[PDB]
Ligand SMILES: CCCCCCC/C=C/CCCCCC(=O)OC[C@@H](O)CO
Ligand SMILES: CCCCCCC/C=C\CCCCCC(=O)OC[C@H](O)CO
Ligand SMILES: CCCCCCC/C=C\CCCCCC(=O)OC[C@H](O)CO
Ligand SMILES: CCCCCCC/C=C\CCCCCC(=O)OC[C@H](O)CO
Ligand SMILES: CCCCCCC/C=C\CCCCCC(=O)OC[C@H](O)CO
Ligand SMILES: CCCCCCC/C=C\CCCCCC(=O)OC[C@H](O)CO
Ligand SMILES: CCCCCCC/C=C\CCCCCC(=O)OC[C@H](O)CO
Ligand SMILES: CCCCCCC/C=C\CCCCCC(=O)OC[C@H](O)CO
Ligand SMILES: CCCCCCC/C=C\CCCCCC(=O)OC[C@H](O)CO
């Protein structure tokens with residue numbers, strides 16, 4: 435019978451949908467920092483490169499934090515499938531805003547649209563994949579690996595296409611390609627979804643009961659009021675700069691798990707997530723810095739004179755696709771969950787330790803071979819194969835899905851503070867210090 439790589443034919447619709455969404459996101463991410471660099475150079479954007487780097491991180495942190503609202507709203511209010519649709523619409527509008535002939539004024543608007551939009555699409559498109567299988571179907575694990583393979587496939591071709599278009603035609607044309615990428619995703623999703631997806635997910639699966647509406651409304655109103663109240667207090671005492679707001683968003687992003695863990699002999703299990711969560715946060719911190727710190731390194735310290743330097747952002751998902759057939763075989767030919775989160779952290783630690791070598795050996799005033807980043811990403815992706823749901827083979831909801839991206843949000847929130855420490859003069863110290871600390875903790879948190 436007809437399948438998509440052994441999976442229900444509905445996976446391909448979700449496959450292509452998320453592939454084109456990740457295309458739009460990572461296509462934009464591949465040049466957004468360089469764009470901010472450009473806006474500063476022209477004197478249009480009045481921030482430092484350190485703040486611009488910090489923005490890239492807190493943006494990423496808010497993107498995956500936003501998913502928690504989206505997962506909840508779909509399950510209880512609007513539905514999984516309309517959430518994906520309207521999520522993509524906002525994403526597309528976000529990229530269109532950047533495509534418009536404006537400068538720094540369009541940044542915030544674009545960022546908010548994509549944050550909100552991705553919050554709706556990302557956890558729900560991931561949830562709809564599990565809806566293709568009944569409960570005890572062995573293929574479910576394989577279906578997600580294919581799905582993540584599509585995530586990285588879009589993450590691979592996006593910098594290559596968008597980055598090249600940027601260096602030939604300009605940023606606005608490049609950002610318009612990202613919008614088009616999402617537009618393609620909507621088309622395939624809308625028409626393909628009607629054919630392959632359950633109509634059951636056009637309505638919420640856990641609809642708010644009558645008595646539940648007001649408590650939720652009070653909870654939300656108090657949260658927004660308090661947030662606004664904090665903003666007001668900040669503006670009065672003078673804490674109203676851009677890094678000030680990043681600090682606030684950082685604390686909020688970090689306080690949410692702290693309060694979530696503090697919420698929850700069964701308690702020894704909960705305490706046993708604490709080091710696993712830390713290992714995850716630190717790993718995705720290092721991993722997400724590829725689009726910031728490594729992107730900075732690529733542009734400043736690497737000879738990329740015969741190709742767009744944004745193409746280095748294709749190295750991350752390339753290795754995931756390369757490692758995929760091996761690990762898929764490796765797990766069938768052959769480690770606990772805490773170990774994989776530790777060894778994965780050690781590999782990420784080694785990816786930074788390696789990057790300290792060229793500056794220590796050759797100095798930082800010159801340029802080095804692309805192979806250093808290639809090797810560095812090879813190491814960090816090697817550990818990602820131990821965390822990310824790929825290389826797998828032969829039930830839940832949207833909110834619990836979001837909880838998974840929550841460790842990446844804390845990592846980037848952590849990055850929003852840490853990436854400001856990276857520059858030309860601290861290169862060797864930054865890499866070696868944070869790489870060594872990550873290996874040590876990787877060795878500490880496995881025995882712990
Ligand atoms: C395509 C490589 C896949 C190998 C997977 C195993 C993990 C290997 C990591 C290699 C460490 C990177 C060393 C490369 C390096 O730093 O040399 C650069 C310099 O020699 C340029 O000529
Ligand atoms: C630039 C503004 C673009 C606005 C989008 C155009 C709106 C046209 C039709 C709205 C359809 C919304 C329902 C789609 C949906 O819920 O997804 C489920 C689909 O049936 C396929 O799964
Ligand atoms: C329903 C929305 C679907 C539209 C998909 C996104 C396409 C939007 C615009 C495509 C054309 C954009 C032209 C880019 C542009 O204005 O360049 C101006 C110069 O490059 C400025 O240096
Ligand atoms: C936890 C994040 C919440 C994000 C904001 C949610 C929007 C604020 C309040 C919910 C809007 C009202 C719900 C609409 C609704 O479906 O009520 C109908 C119920 O079925 C009544 O039985
Ligand atoms: C900015 C914070 C305040 C945001 C308030 C947004 C809340 C929006 C609507 C909440 C009002 C209650 C809606 C109830 C509702 O629509 O129920 C539908 C009925 O079931 C109709 O059959
Ligand atoms: C979800 C719980 C939130 C609890 C945190 C309470 C708010 C505490 C501090 C306000 C946010 C930080 C303001 C920005 C700041 O740190 O100073 C700004 C810079 O130092 C000035 O350039
Ligand atoms: C089947 C893999 C297809 C290959 C696609 C990978 C291309 C994506 C990004 C290119 C990153 C730049 C790598 C350049 C490189 O490794 O050359 C190093 C040479 O030693 C140059 O001195
Ligand atoms: C197994 C994968 C590769 C692991 C790399 C292990 C190398 C560990 C540390 C390399 C960085 C050593 C720092 C050298 C250093 O600090 O020099 C100081 C500067 O030259 C300025 O004085
Ligand atoms: C489970 C796979 C683990 C793979 C680790 C094996 C890699 C071990 C050490 C790589 C260290 C890279 C340093 C290379 C180096 O310093 O050469 C300098 C330049 O090549 C000069 O031409």
Ligand SMILES: CCCCCCC/C=C\CCCCCC(=O)OC[C@H](O)CO
Nearest residue numbers: 439576579580583758762824825826827
């Ligand atoms: C330029 C590529 C865009 C073309 C549309 C996407 C279709 C192309 C390739 C589909 C590749 C599917 C590979 C799935 C895969 O290998 O992972 C499954 C393994 O079992 C992982 O455990």
Ligand SMILES: CC(C)C[C@H](N)C(=O)O
Nearest residue numbers: 456585589718822839842
């Ligand atoms: C934090 C990671 C799990 C995110 C992944 N690279 C994705 O785009 O889905």
